[PDB]
Amino acid sequence: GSEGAATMSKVSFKITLTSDPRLPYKVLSVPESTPFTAVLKFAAEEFKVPAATSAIITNDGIGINPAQTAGNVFLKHGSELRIIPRDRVGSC
């Protein structure tokens, strides 16, 4: 984890693991300034999942581009998102 409570401008995310029949959730807290791309790795390790075949998407089956601050990603995309598995080639 990290140390930081109430800094100035943060953005929390609510992602649920759509892999288990329990659909567990976890509220994360990080500075928007940070890239939403990191939220993945975190949201991953958080669920003890590999940050290789995983990615966060919207509620429209559309991916996300961490080409901006999380606050700009979680805003443009939203907070309520789902973590889905990713695969470049193979998997089958």
Curated annotation (Swiss-Prot):
Gene3D superfamilies: Phosphatidylinositol 3-kinase Catalytic Subunit, Chain A, domain 1
PANTHER family in UniProt: UBIQUITIN-FOLD MODIFIER 1 (PTHR15825:SF5)
Full protein name: Ubiquitin-fold modifier 1
Domain of life: Eukaryota
Protein location: Nucleus; Cytoplasm
Coiled-coil intervals: none
The entry's keywords: Cytoplasm, Isopeptide bond, Nucleus, Ubl conjugation, Ubl conjugation pathway
Tissue specificity: Widely expressed with higher expression in secretory tissues (at protein level).
BP terms from Gene Ontology: brain development; negative regulation of apoptotic process; negative regulation of protein import into nucleus; protein K69-linked ufmylation; protein ufmylation; regulation of intracellular estrogen receptor signaling pathway; response to endoplasmic reticulum stress; reticulophagy
Propeptide residue interval(s): 91-92
Subunit organization: Interacts with UBA5. Interacts with UFC1.
Record-listed cross-link Glycyl lysine isopeptide (Lys-Gly) (interchain with G-Cter in UFM1), residues: K76
Natural source organism: Mus musculus (Mouse)
InterPro entries (alphabetical): Ubiquitin-like_domsf, UFM1
Post-translational modification: UFM1 precursor is cleaved by UFSP1, promoting its maturation: processing of the C-terminal Ser-Cys dipeptide is required to expose its C-terminal conserved Gly residue.
Function: Ubiquitin-like modifier which can be covalently attached via an isopeptide bond to lysine residues of substrate proteins as a monomer or a lysine-linked polymer. The so-called ufmylation, requires the UFM1-activating E1 enzyme UBA5, the UFM1-conjugating E2 enzyme UFC1, and the UFM1-ligase E3 enzyme UFL1. Ufmylation is involved in various processes, such as ribosome recycling, response to DNA damage, transcription or reticulophagy (also called ER-phagy) induced in response to endoplasmic reticulum stress.
CDD domains documented for this protein: Ubl_UFM1
Any single GO CC term annotated in Swiss-Prot or TrEMBL for this entry: cytoplasm
